[PDB]
Design a protein around this ligand. Sequence first.
Ligand SMILES: Nc1ncnc2c1ncn2[C@@H]1O[C@H](COP(=O)(O)OP(=O)(O)O)[C@@H](O)[C@H]1O
Ligand SMILES: Nc1ncnc2c1ncn2[C@@H]1O[C@H](COP(=O)(O)OP(=O)(O)O)[C@@H](O)[C@H]1O
Ligand SMILES: [Cl-]
Ligand SMILES: [Zn+2]
Ligand SMILES: [Zn+2]
Lengths: 69, 69
Amino acid sequence: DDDDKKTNWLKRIYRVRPCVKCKVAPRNWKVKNKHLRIYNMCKTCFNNSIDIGDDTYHGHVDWLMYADS
Amino acid sequence: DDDDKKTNWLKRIYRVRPCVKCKVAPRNWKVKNKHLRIYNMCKTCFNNSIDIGDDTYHGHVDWLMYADS
Ligand SMILES: Nc1ncnc2c1ncn2[C@@H]1O[C@H](COP(=O)(O)OP(=O)(O)O)[C@@H](O)[C@H]1O
Ligand SMILES: Nc1ncnc2c1ncn2[C@@H]1O[C@H](COP(=O)(O)OP(=O)(O)O)[C@@H](O)[C@H]1O
Ligand SMILES: [Cl-]
Ligand SMILES: [Zn+2]
Ligand SMILES: [Zn+2]
């Protein structure tokens, strides 16, 4: 089943690349209708980046959650 | 740059999972407007599957080619 290839990929994509900033925590994310938005940082490091004034790691990658578009 | 995280992922996704049927050739694919469609089989095994009457591996996974949806 093709939807499961996509789901297992997202599961892996999410797991093997932690927060770009602290490198250990997993990334923040949310579901935005038909896509999964994976933010570049965990929530702790994102808030911290505002405080310290660094917007270098700000960003996200959206992933279609289904196999067919 | 976020578009590049998506591109490098697709590059990897495409490379580490060859044809589901013969297991060596890389998969067929095409660009369908804003998505990359990765078919489950290379072209040789897909045509062959019609000939032998097996539709078990028929299918594809579409991937949004950009970071933002
Ligand atoms: N945890 C995070 N790590 C990195 N960047 C983030 C994080 N949370 C938000 N951002 C960035 O801040 C902005 C807010 O995004 P978001 O709230 O998803 O947009 P929208 O409100 O349109 O859904 C975007 O640039 C997003 O990439
Ligand atoms: N190389 C291949 N491997 C596996 N399945 C395939 C392959 N080529 C086509 N198919 C399947 O046959 C059908 C034809 O798909 P496609 O021509 O992409 O649709 P469309 O013409 O709407 O763009 C779909 O079920 C597709 O998944
Ligand atoms: Cl996707
Ligand atoms: Zn972090
Ligand atoms: Zn093959």
